[PDB]
């Protein structure tokens, strides 16, 4: 009696389902029925299952209700088994349990169906419920943007002229960043070979394509369906979209055009931070020394607090009302461009059997989606900051300020918000509160949300990366302040537009009781300790710490201690796990190139942040030993040791693998 | 050329292939029709050859509902097309048609401006929305083998 071990499971269950349904249809029929049509009822079950996966409404015109009620039961029964196995397998994949490439491929294929079923529901609800952004809040959002742009004296981006001599240069840049997608392999399908054909024609005859692109903008408003598929990163899934080449070539030019003109116009104020002249770790450096150059910033003599808020605009992309977005875009660009950009998001998404019209949000895979996100983000920055303070951060149109400076010391002190930036959706705010202002702001919070129970100290987010003497002390004043700041910020933003959540944001309070403020800006995290406080020594032990001067006197005043984010560590570990899959892995040099590329992707980004993060150095030693064992198994060897290290680390020009080392191995 | 203009010969095989294979096997239909991909064959059915398309003339209650919804959700044609029950191409074109009549008769002569907004000598981006060429008398080796 051979067992249902593992590979037998799914085929066995589908037998037991159909065998059970056979019993019921025999019993449910009246005793005078024609003793047939049992097989016909089963085929309806198989169809109802397929309709459920495809999200099609299954309905048979003349089917009698005792059979229909039975099938509607068992489809739900199979759905409960099917869904829970997707949950179970995903919670294994994330933690790094024993898995194989088959179940990883299958589980991704289930999750993407489950996503689309939720997504079709969501888009349908919008038309039935009506637009969640009220007709009064929308006008408020729109009017805000108008007064802002008028104050800047912004000159609208025109429709690109016929004689606009830069056009050919912008075309070449567009085509080059299209062709970079095809560097991976020579194996192409029909749709990809058509794309390279169209690219080569555009090179061979630019004045053809430029006339065709411009003819698209003026006239085209109904576009073809776009594919969707998911990149699997284990820890989460990332959508990827497939756009038809002729549309893609027009979008790529348009993206290049808009960003060039917006830069020249100075649309975006300097706090919109993925910037052409600044790598992300340089952002963190300018941020830290940005803090320290503020006036009096470390003083606590009267009882001053500093508060640092990190948050995300949680579901920014997914909410954007196209009817509003069209009018907002029309304030920047020529209306023909605005109409094109809007319409291009209203496209049929397609994945195998499943199709629906997208209509409530933007498509991230469009070539110009990065423009829309930052402009819409700019609309919401004005909500959080308010018109008045945002004009002081950006400064006069004749003479705009850079990233973290103001005209005067006097203008710094005029408002609590001293520093602001937005990365994409991630928000960073730095507040300076005087003695009285901190008290009054707590009281309002407690008036809405009184806590005699001392629940406030319980659910407070704190980072375990640092010792007990280093992480935030939960003093009752500081905790009450920290929550109350977040509450005030959250009120500024309409929930129909966007929202902020306490579970994913983080708050840190510098105070007479807490000497350290933590934050986690980009891929790595840090805490600033001023030298007039608990350190009392001008230490220099690690190279993993930044001494940072006060710009006026060139005295050191604080230390910034770097560490890698826990999330960034997990990202790297999953990339190593991904390398250890696949069948091309037997080709030794195809592995070690992926290991090398991964390792320099970590090290050259984080630099001195690595050595202070002793938890991550242990992971590097682990990952290196695993991949070396993979080479060994390719030569059998198994458990017997004393395998020579020379074969791995010898540079490729001498015929070794050229492995990069990050551990204390010895010859 | 792969794709291109649709002829009458391909349309009769396309109808007959949906009988054999259904509306969820497009790579089995496109293996039966050369110089057309499965993505194009799917689009050709759903936008000019599904008989649910109300190819007749626009009535007055259709136009009145069009003009409202065009004001109501600007440029978002695909969100309008299942509501009024027409193809979005037809929906856009007829809206463009209605605007042209009213503005021209009130202000203009027969043309006045741009006699060639038409695009000679270049490919159309979407000929699935266009009527079909007839079948030539001398069918070649490719079509008869097909």
């Amino acid at each position: 009696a051979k067992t249902v071990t593992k590979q037998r499971v799914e085929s066995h269950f589908d037998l037991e389902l159909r065998a059970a349904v056979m019993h019921d249809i025999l019993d449910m029929m009246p005793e005078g029925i024609k003793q047939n049509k049992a097989r016909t009822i089963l085929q309806h079950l198989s169809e109802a299952w397929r309709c459920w996966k495809a999200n099609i409404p299954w309905k048979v015109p003349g089917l009698p209700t005792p059979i229909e009620n039975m099938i509607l039961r068992y489809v739900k029964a199979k759905a409960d088994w099917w869904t829970n196995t997707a949950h179970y397998n995903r919670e294994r994949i994330r933690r790094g349990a024993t898995v194989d490439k088959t179940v990883c491929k299958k589980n991704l294929g289930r999750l993407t169906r489950l996503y689309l079923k939720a997504e079709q529901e969501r888009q349908h609800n919008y038309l039935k419920d009506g637009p969640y952004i009220t007709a009064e809040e929308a006008v408020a959002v729109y009017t805000t943007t108008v007064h802002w742009l008028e104050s800047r004296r912004f000159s609208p981006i025109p429709f690109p002229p016929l004689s606009y001599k830069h056009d050919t240069k912008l075309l070449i840049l567009a085509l080059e960043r299209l062709k970079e997608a095809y560097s991976v392999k020579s194996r192409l399908n029909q749709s990809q070979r058509e794309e390279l054909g169209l690219i080569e024609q555009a090179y061979d005859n630019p004045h053809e394509a430029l006339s065709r692109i411009k003819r698209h903008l003026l006239t085209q408003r109904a576009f073809k369906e776009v594919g969707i598929e998911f990149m699997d990163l284990y820890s989460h899934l990332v959508p990827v979209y497939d756009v038809e080449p002729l549309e893609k070539i027009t979008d790529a030019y348009l993206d290049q055009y808009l960003w060039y003109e917006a830069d020249k116009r100075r649309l975006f104020p300097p706090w919109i931070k993925p910037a052409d002249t600044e790598p992300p770790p340089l952002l963190v450096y300018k941020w830290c020394q940005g803090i320290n150059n503020l006036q009096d910033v470390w003083e606590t003599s009267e009882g001053e607090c500093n508060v640092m808020l990190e948050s995300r605009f949680e579901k920014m992309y997914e909410k954007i009302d196209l009817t509003l977005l069209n009018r907002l875009l029309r304030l920047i660009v020529d209306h023909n461009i605005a109409d094109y950009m809007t319409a291009k998001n209203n496209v049929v998404i397609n994945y195998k059997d499943m199709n629906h019209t997208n209509s409530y949000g933007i498509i991230r895979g469009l070539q110009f989606a990065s423009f829309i996100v930052q402009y819409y983000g700019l609309v919401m920055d004005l909500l959080v900051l308010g018109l008045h303070r945002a004009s002081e951060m950006a400064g006069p149109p004749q003479m705009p300020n850079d990233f973290l400076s103001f005209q005067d010391i006097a203008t710094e002190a005029a408002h609590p918000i001293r520093l602001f930036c937005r990365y994409i959706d991630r928000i960073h705010i730095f507040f300076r509160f005087t003695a009285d202002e901190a008290r009054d702001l707590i009281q309002r919070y407690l008036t809405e949300h009184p806590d005699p129970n001392n629940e406030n100290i319980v659910g407070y987010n704190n980072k375990k990366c640092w010792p007990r003497d280093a992480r935030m002390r939960l003093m009752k004043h500081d905790v009450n302040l920290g929550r109350a700041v977040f509450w005030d910020i959250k009120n500024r933003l309409p929930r129909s537009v966007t929202t902020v959540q306490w579970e994913n944001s983080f708050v840190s309070v510098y105070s007479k009781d807490n000497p350290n403020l933590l934050f986690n800006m980009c891929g790595f995290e840090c805490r600033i300790l001023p030298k007039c406080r608990t350190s009392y020594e001008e230490f220099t032990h690690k190279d993993g710490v930044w001494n940072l001067q006060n710009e006026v006197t060139k005295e050191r005043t604080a230390q910034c201690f770097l560490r890698v984010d826990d999330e960034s560590m997990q990202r790297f570990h999953n990339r190593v796990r991904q390398i250890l899959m696949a069948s091309g892995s037997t080709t030794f040099t195809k592995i070690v190139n992926k290991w090398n590329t991964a390792l320099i992707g970590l090290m050259t980004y984080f630099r001195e942040a690595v050595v202070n993060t002793q938890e991550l150095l242990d992971l590097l030693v682990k990952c290196e030993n695993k991949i070396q064992t993979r080479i060994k198994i390719g030569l059998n060897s198994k458990m017997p040791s004393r395998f020579p290290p020379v074969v791995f680390y010898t540079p490729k020009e001498l015929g070794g693998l050229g492995m990069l080392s990050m551990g204390h191995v010895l010859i | 050329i792969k794709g291109g203009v649709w002829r009458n010969t391909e349309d009769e095989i396309l109808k007959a292939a949906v009988m054999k294979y259904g509306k969820n096997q497009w790579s089995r239909i496109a293996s039966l029709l050369h110089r057309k991909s499965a993505k194009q064959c799917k689009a050709r059915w759903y936008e000019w050859l599904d008989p649910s398309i109300k190819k007749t003339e626009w009535s007055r209650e259709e136009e009145e509902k069009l003009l409202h919804l065009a004001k109501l959700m600007p440029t978002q044609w695909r969100t309008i097309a299942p509501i009024i029950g027409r193809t979005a191409a037809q929906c856009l074109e007829h809206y463009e048609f209605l605007l042209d009549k009213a503005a021209q008769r009130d202000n203009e002569e027969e043309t006045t401006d741009d006699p060639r907004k038409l695009k000679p000598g270049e490919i159309d981006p979407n000929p699935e929305t266009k009527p079909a060429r007839p079948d030539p008398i001398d069918m070649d080796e490719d079509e008869l083998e097909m």
Binding site: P156, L331 | P74
Partner: peptide
């Protein structure tokens, strides 16, 4: 005449779609 409401509605749509942006003088 206003009895042909479709002609009035079409005229209204033309005026609302084509106007150039408020940041330049109308």
């Amino acid at each position: 005449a206003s009895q042909d409401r479709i002609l009035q509605e079409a005229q209204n749509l033309m005026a609302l779609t084509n106007v150039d942006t408020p940041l330049k003088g109308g």
